[PDB]
């Protein structure tokens, strides 16, 4: 039996908030503009450091600890870039037209053109951030969505425990919306709207994963061994 199912909605919200990873910085070199090599270097170094904190976070998502190591690995391998991307989009919400990769690394779409074929992905990321902004996405809703990605994205490519936890997170999202004063109709409409955005986040991750592989093959940036392994999981 898992401890996660006993949690109340407020307890779920609290636990998820307390699990949030820190906001990392990029290098302090102010040399501009970025080359393709410089840019991919900075994004890669940042993602690599973020990944370590993501694992700590995942282990503190209620229910994740109850999984076998194998299952934990599978979910993280599947969802890692989705999770980095929803975080990116969330951090960028209050910066229309920009992607806040880090507090000292705020980029616009023109800087996406620094790397061949990245501006298309930048544009999708910006569109998502704009969507979250217009929906007035709340921090409490965000951590629920991010946990949902962790548990859901790999669950069809292995069970009941994960789905019960996913159900608990749905309950929590609804509780949050009711607490915000939404009518029942507004609650289910908003739930739908948020969960549909996860389909776009999946699309972006898949586009990103091909771009990364393409970058690996082109030897534009040395990827870290961890990143190589996360990338290699997508075959």
């Amino acid at each position: 039996n898992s401890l996660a199912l006993s949690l109340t909605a407020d307890q779920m919200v609290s636990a998820l908030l307390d699990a949030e990873p820190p906001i990392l910085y990029s290098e302090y070199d102010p040399t501009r503009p970025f080359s393709e090599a410089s840019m991919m270097g900075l994004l890669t170094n940042l993602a690599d450091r973020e990944l370590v904190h993501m694992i700590n976070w995942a282990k503190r998502v209620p229910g994740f600890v109850d999984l076998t190591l194998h299952d934990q690995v599978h979910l993280l391998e599947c969802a890692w870039l989705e999770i980095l991307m929803i975080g990116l989009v969330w951090r960028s919400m209050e910066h229309p037209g920009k992607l806040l990769f880090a507090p000292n690394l705020l980029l616009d779409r023109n800087q996406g053109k620094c790397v061949e074929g990245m501006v298309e992905i930048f544009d999708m990321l910006l569109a998502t951030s704009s969507r979250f902004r217009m929906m007035n996405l709340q921090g409490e809703e965000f951590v629920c969505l991010k946990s949902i990605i962790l548990l859901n994205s790999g669950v069809y490519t292995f069970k009941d425990h994960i789905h019960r936890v996913l159900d608990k997170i749905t309950d929590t999202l609804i509780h949050l919306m009711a607490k915000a004063g939404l009518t029942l109709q507004q609650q289910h409409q908003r739930l739908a709207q948020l969960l549909l955005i996860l389909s776009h986040i999946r699309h972006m991750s898949n586009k990103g994963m091909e771009h990364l592989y393409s970058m690996k093959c082109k030897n534009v940036v040395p990827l870290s061994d961890l990143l190589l392994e996360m990338l290699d999981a997508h075959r």
Partner: peptide, 13 residues
């Protein structure tokens, strides 16, 4: 097989 992810998950803080 050896995975860095294995070590990270096992030593998570």
């Amino acid at each position: 097989k050896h995975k860095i992810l294995h070590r990270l998950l096992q030593d998570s803080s």
